[model samples]
Target: LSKEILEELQLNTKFTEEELSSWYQSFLKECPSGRITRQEFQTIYSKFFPEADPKAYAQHVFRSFDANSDGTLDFKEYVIALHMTSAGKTNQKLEWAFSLYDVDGNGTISKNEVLEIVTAIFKMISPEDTKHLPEDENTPEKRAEKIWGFFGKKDDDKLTEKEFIEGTLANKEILRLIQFEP
Candidate 1:
């Protein structure tokens, strides 16, 4: 029980001491070096969704979680990501979702950006997985178009932070599509 770890987690996360200790132990077991590289994160994440190819999605998640852009996630970053993705408030999740979709870091999300992420998401799943779904919801492009249309945008339109957050909060389907919890 490192006082520094406990203090940091207490300040940044909502987990109890027991939960934090358990998570820290597991984290140490998996990441003995006290830091997780992008490749390691992808390997761990792929285990959760063995039916899909999670490489691209994992990269995006790694990018979002690597707060310092140091090419690796330390204990603090890992715990913070875990809390934010799993138990953080709706607005917090949406804000993170916005960052994930805003690939260019231009402070605005464009249709192409949304399509890229949606396409990556669809790529993670196999065609057989969507066999039972309707045609409109089967393909990545179609889903991206539907999501973009929900925002009532033209070809060159861009979604601001406010628009992205409000729009995502209002629509369940869109939220489900863009919200990354893995």
Candidate 2:
């Protein structure tokens, strides 16, 4: 029932909003592939929590869960990242949700992040609803390619703060995925 932003809990621990916001925004800009990052983990922990011993924890998550290891957290890797978050059912969902939103893995999410998730959702869902759509609609593959074309650029693919907020995240396909579609 409690739906606070995941960053608040993270900030409560060590990372500041500015630092996390910067890291998250940068992460999306660079890692379009949604790969996980180990270094960013260390930077966040060290920069904000130098007194605490976060090296082991950072390495553990990055080493054990960072499936892509390109250097940021991705949704798949975040199941493990949950242990690092707050303690509650809502917290748990927010933990995973935040990581999923962190498409490029810089650590914080942005409007571009929302765009990335929604676009992915549309690609993932529109295919199903197409049975009800007309023939003139964009094909799944083409839509996917366009989504990638918009979100799949290299580090050059940056997003402004305003654009990121206006972006969407929920779609029928993603809802279906939540229901167990592939």
Candidate 3:
């Protein structure tokens, strides 16, 4: 993809012309079939995280990448993933972070979902750093409450994607809280 196309897609990349062209050509060559399958994605992820179970992270990563929910990623979508997961706009990263726990696809993330994802993240730690995870940590409910507070949401048990993105990007603690482990 050209730099213009990359910017049109809202990918926040800082590649030089030569680097961008090289990456685009390499991407095409790597995925000659013009798309990425779940298995392919899992294989690549396993190279970086061999000890972790592939299914969980791969599913979330693919969901974040597959913009159309069609189980595949074209060049533009892949580039978007690269940018968003790396150094994209804060809103873009926050958006994907919200989707990771919005597993029901209901356009809102429930408190239960936040707790579940948080608990899962805690469990993912091999030695279980329940005591040393973060200095501002508390119960999942409080965490969720502080997060929703950023959006001025009261008496609401679930958070809209808009609330999630805006609140997460605005608060450093919530941003750190919702971050996924590799």
Candidate 4:
């Protein structure tokens, strides 16, 4: 089984065979069925962020990682998402982040979409986690508005992939907010 996973990871990720095997061992320990359900994902995520409410944010992240839209994450999808966020280039990470915010798979991000994703992320942050931020950005709504403005808010504005990538790349704060770490 590890041999099969090694071949798959080699084709889909840049990680070494040893690393993939190590991950497989841990994954199996956590999920003996070799698939992670949304509820399980949320539980694991909450363990990592015990001080915050990770349920909503975990749902969004789970959706993005469910590459086949099958409502569960297999080893392939899990490793791909892990590699993209933790080791992929900036463009790769930004592209994944864009998909998380583009909730409807509409190929563009709307104001409401931004609000929803930002709100979910804010829910995963403890009050102490954001105490260092400015008053204007201390709230989820305020941070969402500022992020939207960075993408050039206009009448009926929608952020294209290019706009999202460039806008996020230019704004350190916005990038920090949406960036996923494992």
* Candidate number of the best lDDT: 4
Q: Candidate 4: lDDT of 78?
A: 75
* Per-prediction backbone clash count: 0, 10, 0, 0
Model-by-model lDDT, in order?
A: 0.76, 0.44, 0.63, 0.76
Query: How do all models score by TM-score?
Result: 0.81, 0.29, 0.70, 0.82
Residues 108-134 of candidate 4 have per-residue lDDT tens digits of: 888888889888887766868667767
TM-score of structure candidate 3: 0.70
- Give lDDT tens digits, candidate 2, residues 73-157: 6633442354443333433343344455566666554545545444443433334464664333244434333332433332334
| Tens digit per residue, CA lDDT, model 1, 1-182 | 57887878777666777888887788889888888898887887688778787788778767877866899988777766655545447665677888778887779999888888787777677667667645776677887887887777655668888877888888777787666433
Where does candidate 4 stray beyond 4 Å? 1-15, 82-89, 170-173, 177-182
Candidate 3 regions exceeding 4 Å error are 2-4, 9-11, 86-89, 119-132, 135-157
- lDDT ranking, best first: 4, 1, 3, 2
Order of candidate numbers by TM-score, starting with the best: 4, 1, 3, 2
Give Cα distance to truth, residue 85, candidate 4, Å.
6.1
**Which whole-number lDDT from 0 to 100 does residue 158 have in model 3?**
71
- Model 1 CA lDDT for position 133: 49
Off by over 4 Å in 2: 1-26, 30-33, 68-72, 75-83, 90-182
Please state the error at residue 82 of candidate 2 in Å: 6.1
